[PDB]
Design a binder for this molecule. Structure first.
Ligand SMILES: CC1=N[C@@H]2[C@@H](O)[C@H](O)[C@@H](CO)O[C@@H]2S1
Length: 635
């Protein structure tokens, strides 16, 4: 079997037999992107909190039988890109997050956790499954804790959410061991140089089995109680039926035991509630100033995919959820809505830090895959391992008059599946901007800007940078006019005049001198970097496995050696006279679900190539290999 699959264990004995590398799809299942650092920028919303956090508990993956752990040949996906508002992403469906989610989260500076789920049950079988997890060696260590930590290290993820819903007589006396399991895990993770965090559901009490407090209280505080420095649960997920009094209690309890109240995440039941249609007791969790007094736990926000029919609808619905109905993260909840956008209440963060930042707005899925503005893969995909860094703000706009509509464009892109489009009927002379990214990028004599764009007929368009933390765009050396045309162009600008300064934000600015019917401008790629070099080509590239369906269709797995300058890799086949992209991945082992030849294909072999796409946005020279069909298409 070539297709990589989610990792699932039928028993604790099976987990105890786990060893690094002992599964045929391990090379693909490992995360490949190290967890990025993030900056917390200046607040842009007067009601936002830098203390309040958001944890998402999401069913991230297809449920289709025989779906791949890396994605698939379908556009519709939980192509999450609102990482800027998340503390963490919980992979709800299983113990071991898939590489497509680990990679996307890590590139965006967000930790990803597996889920250790004990069934809502009092069956002896379930009670025993729970007790069995807490088996100890003579020295008091927990062998299952070691395997959890070992897996987190090997596959490259950040810890676990524990949902302990099993109850009954055998469960009740096990609070102490469960607490010690979590503390021991920390000791062991430190020992193996791979720290992990635990998030803990408000379910199993210390002494009385399952009982939801809807908060932190007298029956569950032990799970958050510190051992000086160390803690058992890092994060606590409060059950959904909180209120003012329960929240007051939670805060009192956290403070008393010496924990930050914001480590308590007040649950929102978004599955039964319908995503942003969920009734929340906002008045019970907002203080006198309209600011959050606890964190927010998002239960099943993946539900939002049910609210639209298309993949384009997925992102628009996420906008309502994360930004708010008012459509601008600097604005307040409309008077005729109940839902607060996350951005209304929670400060954004940004992984766009250092001397290099690049993006082509790759959301990890598309209808097609574009290569320098030309269709290369002419069909749908989701491979979230390649997910990039989308705008911090969606959409922070100011205008002298009317505002252009900003949206993702899955019909035309520069690299990957979509660009950003800014469009509308312009009624008359107007100046306006769109503030896109919060950043902290150090400029040197070697720093350049590369910007790929298209359209803008009837306007002047500029990109401008703020060199202050409070996002003022008053620096004359930080404005660049774009040279517009009807086709994709990629322009480089010298940023050396800004050497020694720091860029804190990026915006577009539009001038229209009069009316323009169906104005459109696309932004396709943005790079700020002191590196203009092609990354080195991959080496030692080969087909390591294959399975022909027929003479025209095969699965394959390819492997190669990369380098530190590569952000991710693209694999292509030569289809007649044309190279066509198959897939992309952050990994150096890559599954090809369909290598294909037409009816007119000549010979018994077919060329494949792999290209490194740099952290600086530049492609390497290709490495090539030959796929051997062993037969002609007419044989
Ligand atoms: C964390 C949580 N664990 C439980 C889930 O397994 C259920 O599906 C959900 C039903 O609303 O309730 C709590 S939320």
């Amino acid at each position: 079997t070539l297709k990589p699959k989610e990792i699932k264990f039928n028993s604790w004995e099976e987990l105890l037999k786990w060893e690094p590398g002992a599964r045929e799809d391990d090379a693909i299942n490992r995360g490949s992107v190290v967890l990025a650092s993030r900056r917390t920028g200046h607040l842009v919303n007067e009601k936002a909190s830098k203390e309040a956090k958001v944890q998402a508990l999401s069913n991230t993956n297809s449920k289709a039988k025989d779906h791949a752990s890396v994605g698939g040949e379908e556009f519709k996906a939980y192509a999450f890109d609102y990482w800027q508002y998340l503390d963490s992403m919980v992979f709800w469906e299983g113990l071991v997050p898939t590489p497509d989610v680990i990679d996307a989260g890590h590139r965006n500076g967000v930790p990803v956790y597996g889920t250790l789920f004990f069934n809502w049950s009092n069956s002896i079988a379930d009670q025993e499954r729970f007790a069995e997890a807490l088996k100890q060696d003579a020295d008091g260590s927990f062998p299952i804790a070691r395997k959890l930590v070992d897996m987190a290290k090997y596959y490259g993820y950040d810890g676990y959410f524990i949902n302990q819903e099993t109850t009954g007589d055998l469960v009740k006396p096990l609070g102490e061991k469960m607490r010690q399991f979590m503390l021991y895990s920390k000791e062991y993770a430190a020992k193996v140089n791979h720290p992990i965090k635990y998030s803990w559901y408000d379910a199993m009490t210390y002494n009385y089995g399952r009982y939801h407090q809807d908060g932190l209280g007298e029956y569950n505080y032990q799970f958050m109680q510190p051992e000086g420095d160390k803690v058992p649960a890092d994060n606590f997920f409060a059950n959904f039926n909180w209120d003012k009094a329960k929240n007051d209690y939670t805060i009192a309890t956290a403070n008393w035991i010496g924990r930050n109240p914001y480590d308590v995440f007040a649950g929102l039941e978004l599955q039964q509630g319908g995503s942003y249609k969920t009734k929340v007791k906002w008045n019970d969790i907002l203080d006198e100033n309209g600011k959050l007094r606890l964190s927010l736990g998002l239960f099943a926000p993946d539900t939002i995919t049910s609210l639209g029919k298309t993949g384009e609808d997925y992102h628009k619905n996420e906008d309502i959820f994360f930004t708010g109905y008012q459509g601008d993260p600097t604005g307040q909840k409309p008077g005729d809505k109940d839902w607060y956008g996350i951005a209304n209440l929670v400060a954004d963060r940004t992984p766009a830090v250092g001397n290099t930042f690049t993006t082509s707005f790759n959301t990890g899925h598309g209808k097609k895959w574009f290569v320098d503005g030309k269709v290369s893969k002419d069909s749908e995909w989701n491979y979230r391992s390649v997910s990039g860094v989308l705008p911090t703000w969606r959409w922070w706009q100011t205008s002298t008059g009317e505002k252009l509509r900003a949206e993702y464009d899955f019909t035309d892109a520069y690299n990957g599946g979509n660009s950003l489009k800014f469009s509308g009927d312009v009624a008359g002379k107007t100046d306006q901007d769109v503030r896109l990214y919060s950043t902290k990028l150090e400029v040197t004599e070697k720093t350049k800007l590369r910007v790929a764009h298209k359209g803008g007929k009837g306007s002047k368009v500029y990109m401008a940078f703020s060199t202050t933390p409070d996002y003022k765009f008053d620096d004359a050396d930080a404005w660049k006019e774009l040279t517009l045309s009807d086709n994709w162009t990629n322009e480089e600008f010298d940023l050396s005049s800004l050497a020694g300064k720091t860029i804190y934000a990026v915006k577009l600015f539009f001038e229209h001198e009069g009316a323009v019917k169906d104005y459109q401008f696309n932004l396709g790629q943005l790079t700020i970097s002191d590196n203009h070099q092609e990354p080195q080509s991959p080496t030692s590239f080969s087909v390591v496995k294959q399975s022909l369906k027929n003479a025209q269709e095969a699965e394959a797995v390819v492997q190669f050696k990369g380098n530190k300058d590569a952000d991710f890799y693209e694999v292509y086949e030569k289809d007649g006279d044309s190279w066509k992209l198959l897939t992309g991945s952050s990994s150096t082992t890559i599954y090809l679900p369909k290598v294909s030849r037409s009816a007119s294909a000549q010979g018994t072999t077919q060329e494949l190539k792999v290209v490194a796409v740099g952290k600086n946005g530049v492609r390497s020279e290709a490495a090539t290999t030959t796929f051997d069909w062993g037969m002609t298409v007419k044989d």
